[PDB]
Amino acid sequence: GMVRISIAGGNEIDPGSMGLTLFHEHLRLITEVVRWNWPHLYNEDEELKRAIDAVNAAKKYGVKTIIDLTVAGIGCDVRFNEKVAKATGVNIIMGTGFYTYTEIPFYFKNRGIDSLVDAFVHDITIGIQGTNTRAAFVKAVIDSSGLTKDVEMAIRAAAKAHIKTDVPIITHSFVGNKSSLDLIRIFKEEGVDLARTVIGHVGDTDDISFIEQILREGAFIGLDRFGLDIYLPLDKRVKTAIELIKRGWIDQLLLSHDYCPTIDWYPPEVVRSTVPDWTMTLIFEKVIPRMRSEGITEEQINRVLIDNPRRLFTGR
Amino acid sequence: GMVRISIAGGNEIDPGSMGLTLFHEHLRLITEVVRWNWPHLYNEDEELKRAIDAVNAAKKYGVKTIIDLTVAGIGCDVRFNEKVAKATGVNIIMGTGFYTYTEIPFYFKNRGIDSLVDAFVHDITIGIQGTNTRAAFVKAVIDSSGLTKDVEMAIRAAAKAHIKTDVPIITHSFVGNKSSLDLIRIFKEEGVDLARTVIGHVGDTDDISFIEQILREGAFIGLDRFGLDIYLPLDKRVKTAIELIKRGWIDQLLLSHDYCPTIDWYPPEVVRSTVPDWTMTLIFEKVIPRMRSEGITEEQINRVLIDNPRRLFTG
Ligand SMILES: CCCCCCCCCCCCCC(=O)O
Ligand SMILES: CCCCCCCCCCCCCC(=O)O
Ligand SMILES: [Co+2]
Ligand SMILES: [Co+2]
Ligand SMILES: [Co+2]
Ligand SMILES: [Co+2]
Numbered sequence: 001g002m003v004r005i006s007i008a009g010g011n012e013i014d015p016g017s018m019g020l021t022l023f024h025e026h027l028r029l030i031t032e033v034v035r036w037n038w039p040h041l042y043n044e045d046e047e048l049k050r051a052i053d054a055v056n057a058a059k060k061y062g063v064k065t066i067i068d069l070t071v072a073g074i075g076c077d078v079r080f081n082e083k084v085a086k087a088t089g090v091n092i093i094m095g096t097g098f099y100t101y102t103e104i105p106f107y108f109k110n111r112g113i114d115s116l117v118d119a120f121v122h123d124i125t126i127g128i129q130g131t132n133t134r135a136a137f138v139k140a141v142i143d144s145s146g147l148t149k150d151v152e153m154a155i156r157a158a159a160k161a162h163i164k165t166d167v168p169i170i171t172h173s174f175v176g177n178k179s180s181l182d183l184i185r186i187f188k189e190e191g192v193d194l195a196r197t198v199i200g201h202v203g204d205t206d207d208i209s210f211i212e213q214i215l216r217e218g219a220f221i222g223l224d225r226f227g228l229d230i231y232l233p234l235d236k237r238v239k240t241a242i243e244l245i246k247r248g249w250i251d252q253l254l255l256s257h258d259y260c261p262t263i264d265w266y267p268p269e270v271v272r273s274t275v276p277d278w279t280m281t282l283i284f285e286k287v288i289p290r291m292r293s294e295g296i297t298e299e300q301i302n303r304v305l306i307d308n309p310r311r312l313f314t315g316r
Numbered sequence: 317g318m319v320r321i322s323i324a325g326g327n328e329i330d331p332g333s334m335g336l337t338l339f340h341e342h343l344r345l346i347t348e349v350v351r352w353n354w355p356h357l358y359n360e361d362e363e364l365k366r367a368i369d370a371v372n373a374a375k376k377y378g379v380k381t382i383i384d385l386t387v388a389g390i391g392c393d394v395r396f397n398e399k400v401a402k403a404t405g406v407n408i409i410m411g412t413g414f415y416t417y418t419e420i421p422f423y424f425k426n427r428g429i430d431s432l433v434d435a436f437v438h439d440i441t442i443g444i445q446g447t448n449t450r451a452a453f454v455k456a457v458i459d460s461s462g463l464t465k466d467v468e469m470a471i472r473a474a475a476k477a478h479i480k481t482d483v484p485i486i487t488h489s490f491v492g493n494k495s496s497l498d499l500i501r502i503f504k505e506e507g508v509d510l511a512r513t514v515i516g517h518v519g520d521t522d523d524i525s526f527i528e529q530i531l532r533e534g535a536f537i538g539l540d541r542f543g544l545d546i547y548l549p550l551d552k553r554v555k556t557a558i559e560l561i562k563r564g565w566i567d568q569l570l571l572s573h574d575y576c577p578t579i580d581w582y583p584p585e586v587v588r589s590t591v592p593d594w595t596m597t598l599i600f601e602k603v604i605p606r607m608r609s610e611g612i613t614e615e616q617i618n619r620v621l622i623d624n625p626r627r628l629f630t631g
Contacts, residue, residue: 031421031422031423032348032349032352032353033348033349033388033389033421034388034421034423034424036348036352036388036391037348037387037388037392037435037445038388038435038438038439039445039446040438040442040446041435071353072349072350072352072353072354073349075352076353102418102419103418103419105347105349105350106347106581107347107350107580107581108350110581110582110583110586111583119353119354119357122354122356126356129353129355130355130356264423265422265423265426266426267426267427270426
């Protein structure tokens with residue numbers, strides 16, 4: 001009767017039971033080819049401990065549900081997420097897609113777009129990685145390389161999988177080249193209702209004119225990297241969030257941290273040194289209190305953190 | 317007192333016991349990110365049967381040793397190769413390297429070349445994938461995209477790992493853009509003895525003067541894709557191999573098929589339709605009999621299929 005959302009560990013929830021949700025986080029971000037070939041560079045016990053400690057920190061602030069935006073290309077592992085879910089009791093929602101900024105595998109290029117659609121559709125309708133945990137969203141990615149041929153093919157495939165299954169599309173974009181607008185254009189060509197999409201990493205700018213260009217199209221926007229000052233400082237992100245509420249856009253806003261308890265792209269020392277304030281709790285510690293002090297209401301914070309993630313999954 | 321070569325399944329051999337060797341083959345060629353995320357697209361039992369069947373086929377012609385050129389990027393799996401080795405009794409030599417034509421992972425780019433060197437050195441000195449099977453060679457790869465910055469880094473890392481460990485370098489190149497010559501240039505910059513290297517896929521051309529430009533540098537050349545007519549037809553490959561022995565180059569020639577019993581880049585029906593003669597035995601069925609017919613001797617075939625693979629590993 002309702003949408004059914006698989007969560008890690010074998011169960012399903014309805015959108016109404018998501019509760020307070022962090023819509024864009026990670027449990028472990030790692031690179032399949034490196035981990036497959038060089039296991040010596042990794043420590044699964046420490047990775048799991050870090051994920052568990054971060055999710056438990058969020059749970060203390062009343063987070064009920066975390067959407068793990070880790071998909072193929074950045075190391076999605078259902079079985080690892082099952083262990084975090086068992087340990088913390090937080091609902092972990094997973095998805096499908098192919099994360100790349102430039103190229104896709106020969107496997108798919110040599111078979112054509114439908115082979116990639118079909119793999120996503122498999123995950124959504126049957127289950128991820130031989131499990132009964134189905135993908136509840138599809139991801140599309142674009143970054144500072146722009147719309148390469150292969151990047152365009154993967155965005156189109158995500159769009160086509162959404163058309164077949166009706167799961168929402170959660171995206172990653174790069175604000176510096178206006179690549180967010182390419183997602184919009186392709187999604188419209190493919191017939192996607194933009195209200196079932198999130199334009200990711202829009203919080204990495206404070207350019208209101210650019211942000212409202214996206215918002216006027218009807219998509220959700222991801223104010224989704226709070227704590228990554230290297231993309232945009234915290235004070236600018238909070239000022240932007242507050243201004244967009246004051247201009248009437250609350251129903252389109254989604255907040256998160258994009259936190260990676262492990263990320264293999266960089267040594268852990270370098271992450272600590274560069275973005276020491278990045279955690280999975282900074283929204284609760286710093287952002288919400290500042291918004292409340294500037295007149296944002298309790299019920300407006302609930303609309304953003306509860307209603308908006310729920311409606312991404314249900315529609316109107 | 318001799319070089320020690322690990323082989324799949326825990327043991328070590330010396331170069332003198334390699335015997336008749338196929339120096340560039342594959343047992344399973346698969347894409348890590350795809351197999352990790354989409355296991356439904358694969359069938360390990362079928363992959364294993366195909367690898368066993370091909371290796372057994374070669375074993376019937378007296379092959380004793382196969383060098384698996386599958387490294388990171390094309391799905392190297394020591395445990396898989398252990399199964400094949402146990403079933404067939406053929407010695408399987410493995411290596412290390414990073415197979416790419418364009419990019420390498422952020423993991424390494426963000427840490428610097430020495431991180432990639434160190435990973436290769438780990439495989440050579442400790443072992444691959446948590447096993448006591450050590451990499452006995454290092455691979456460097458360039459193709460139709462030419463010398464990208466990341467390709468350059470991986471070629472240089474291969475060279476630096478060779479300088480530290482003395483294992484041979486076995487390469488992949490692409491003949492249409494003369495990328496083979498970028499390998500040589502970089503290896504010379506890094507101080508590599510080219511006699512300890514193989515310039516791969518040189519058999520994809522019949523341009524004898526180009527092939528000789530590479531030969532005069534002192535490296536081994538890989539006449540290594542017999543049966544891949546899409547790269548060069550069989551008759552042209554065999555004519556080239558005969559001519560190069562007649563000209564005096566035998567000590568630098570290596571023959572193989574590059575055969576992939578499974579390859580996930582293309583559906584199997586497409587492979588069968590396009591290269592229906594590609595197998596791990598075509599050299600024995602078609603190539604050697606034509607060479608013998610044209611005056612190449614029994615001993616010359618042994619020098620190429622036994623002595624040259626051995627000398628790659630001993631100097
Ligand atoms: C030199 C900068 C080092 C620290 C940078 C932290 C990295 C932020 C990674 C952004 C999120 C990972 C990828 C993704 O989730 O799309
Ligand atoms: C248009 C269809 C072409 C199908 C032909 C099969 C091609 C296989 C060649 C790849 C060789 C493996 C990669 C490598 O070993 O470097
Ligand atoms: Co992202
Ligand atoms: Co993310
Ligand atoms: Co090759
Ligand atoms: Co090969």
